[PDB]
């Protein structure tokens, strides 16, 4: 109910280190939102979706983060991947929306913008909603690494190339994700 | 910016083919690459892409595991593979610059790809007589019919380019024995029949057959 | 979105303005491309980003996109402009998606066919095999129905047709009908007829031979 800031964030963070805002209780107003054509896609799981707000819910979450075009399809609640089994996970039983729109325009660097990383290598998935921002050395091979970076120790993370002349499906991408929480104290 | 694509190909079913697109302007700089194919009559159905710069190519759905997509970094060359080929992988074969706004730019010229089991065949040329109990209006249709070649590509002119105006070559159609065959008419003064000679004249490049054909009235 | 919708056809009298629609759900979140493709060519692409035109396509080719419609619009139609038009887009979950394609004619008052028949050549029938031609000259519309009949017997099944692109100068389609037959079944037979059925046609027009009388 202050969506605001959220979607006009100048400044948005890396996948693996996702953004969380928390929103409880106040005027919120989906008859806007879920028709713009400022967004590329908008999809709701567990609500009416084009029957829209007659929810009312005690708490929402929006997680906001930047990923490739091509891996948006991850966000989504039961989809396997770099992106949904090392930096976003869903639950299978999803209740919310997932937005997103190309930011090639402010995302992506005519030398490619790096500051923008994700988590290549994790020893398992994560659960629904976990975020995980170690930077533990991964270790490929059968010798442990204690530190070092030389073959089959890897740093986890690695940058997006973003490169604004690449094709749509390698731009960058802004992603938020509104959960709707309800759970039983309301 | 241009695209020069490899030579067409003949595939038996089963087998594999490997297509490859090389840039002109020297070198595949940042931008992306698709690979799209059309069948005979059909429309155009992407099967997948890559940036050369990042290796790492992704496919249309169907197709998932029997297409491979790969860049040649030196040769400014982008190749596309298909394999377990059956007949309906018969199709022209494009590579495309992809676009900032999402869409494609420079194409390709295309590649002919047809799978199929039958063997090379040039064509035996057949006249179509202009009928002997003919036409008012004064005009008299003859032709040539161009029966079972095989793989696609038949080109004909009439009297060596000289006689164009009433030509109607009709597009190839595949027979169910697996070969081609096309006809080629002509309109011409029935007052010309014994006077004007009439010559098709039939190109079949994939079996180095070339045949002139007079085309009269029959006995 | 995910499905791209065209209708299969627009006929357009010259110097009239076509229009090609391209449905999808919210397509209007989507940076549609419109391409334009003859017969043996690449597509080129006409309008990209909506509305915008490459450099060196004419004036006269413009685009929309709106809700659930994007639009082609062709003005002051040539017959240059015979051709089928693609819309397409990228989709988040699909990748790039092709519309159906939409073939544009020039239209045209009716005209009938000119019909002739040709028998097999005693050329071909050495070889075992004789092929009976059914030509159909310069008409409009392209619609026309053939029925081959051989002693009266309707044939159905042992024809295939081909039909040439819209004549550039006079906007008229062709069309060829050919009826394969073994040579003993063809020498069984005598009167070998083409029945044409087409708008322009008050009633069909059959073409026919005799074997062996010409």
């Known amino acids: 109910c202050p969506f605001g800031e959220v979607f006009n964030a100048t400044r948005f963070a890396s996948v693996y280190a996702w953004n969380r805002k928390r929103i409880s209780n106040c005027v919120a107003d989906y008859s806007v939102l879920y028709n713009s054509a400022s967004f590329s896609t908008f999809k709701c799981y567990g609500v009416s979706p084009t029957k829209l707000n007659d929810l009312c819910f005690t708490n929402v979450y929006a997680d906001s983060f930047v990923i490739r075009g091509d891996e948006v399809r991850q966000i989504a609640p039961g989809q396997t991947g770099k992106i949904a089994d090392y930096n976003y996970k869903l639950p299978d039983d999803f209740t919310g929306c997932v937005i997103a729109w190309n930011s090639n325009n402010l995302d992506s660097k005519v030398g490619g913008n790096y500051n923008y990383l994700y988590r290549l290598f994790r020893k398992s998935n994560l659960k629904p909603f976990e975020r995980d921002i170690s930077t533990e050395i991964y270790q490929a091979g059968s010798t442990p690494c204690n530190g070092v970076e030389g073959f089959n120790c890897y740093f986890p993370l690695q940058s997006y190339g973003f490169q604004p002349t690449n094709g749509v499906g390698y731009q960058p991408y802004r992603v938020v994700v509104l959960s709707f929480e309800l759970l039983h104290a309301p | 910016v241009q695209l020069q694509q490899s030579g067409a190909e003949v595939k038996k079913p089963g087998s594999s083919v490997k297509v490859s697109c090389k840039a002109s302007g020297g070198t595949f700089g940042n931008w992306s690459i698709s690979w799209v194919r059309q069948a005979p009559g059909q429309g155009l159905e992407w099967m997948g892409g890559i940036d050369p710069s990042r290796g790492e190519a992704t496919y249309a759905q169907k197709f998932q595991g029997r297409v491979t997509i790969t860049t040649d970094e030196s040769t400014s060359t982008a190749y596309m593979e298909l394999s377990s080929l059956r007949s309906e992988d018969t199709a022209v074969y494009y590579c495309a610059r992809e676009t900032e706004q999402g869409g494609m730019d420079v194409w390709g010229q295309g590649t002919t790809v047809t799978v199929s089991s039958a063997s090379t065949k040039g064509p035996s040329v057949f006249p179509l007589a202009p009928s002997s109990k003919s036409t008012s209006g004064g005009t008299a249709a003859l032709g040539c019919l161009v029966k079972d070649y095989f793989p696609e590509p038949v080109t004909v002119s009439w009297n060596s380019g000289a006689l164009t105006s009433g030509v109607h070559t009709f597009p190839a159609v595949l027979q169910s024995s697996g070969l081609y065959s096309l006809s080629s008419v002509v309109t011409v003064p029935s007052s010309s029949l014994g006077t004007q000679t009439y010559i098709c004249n039939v190109n079949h490049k994939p079996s180095n057959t070339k045949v002139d054909k007079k085309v009269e009235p029959k006995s | ?214």
Do not use: M
């Not at chain 3, 550039?168 to 069309?175: I, N, R, V």
């Open chain 3, 1 to 214: 979105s995910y499905e791209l919708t065209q209708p299969p056809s627009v006929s357009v009298a010259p110097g009239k303005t076509a229009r090609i629609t391209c449905g999808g759900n919210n397509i209007g979140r989507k940076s549609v491309h419109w391409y334009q493709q003859k017969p043996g060519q690449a597509p080129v692409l006409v309008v990209y980003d909506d509305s915008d035109r490459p450099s060196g396509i004419p004036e006269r080719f413009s685009g929309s996109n709106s809700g659930n419609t994007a639009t082609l619009t062709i003005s002051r139609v040539e017959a240059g402009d015979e051709a089928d038009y693609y819309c397409q887009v990228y989709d988040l979950f699909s990748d790039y998606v092709f519309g159906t394609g939409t073939k544009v004619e020039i239209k045209r008052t009716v005209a009938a066919p000119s019909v002739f028949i040709f028998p097999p050549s005693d050329e071909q029938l050495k070889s075992g095999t004789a092929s009976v031609v059914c030509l159909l000259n310069n008409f409009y519309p392209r619609e026309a129905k053939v029925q081959w009949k051989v002693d009266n017997a309707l044939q159905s099944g042992n024809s295939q047709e081909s039909v040439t692109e819209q004549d550039s100068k006079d906007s008229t389609y062709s069309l060829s009908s050919t009826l394969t037959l073994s040579k003993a079944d063809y020498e069984k037979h005598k009167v070998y007829a083409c029945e044409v059925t087409h708008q322009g046609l008050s009633s069909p027009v059959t073409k026919s031979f005799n074997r062996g009388e010409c």
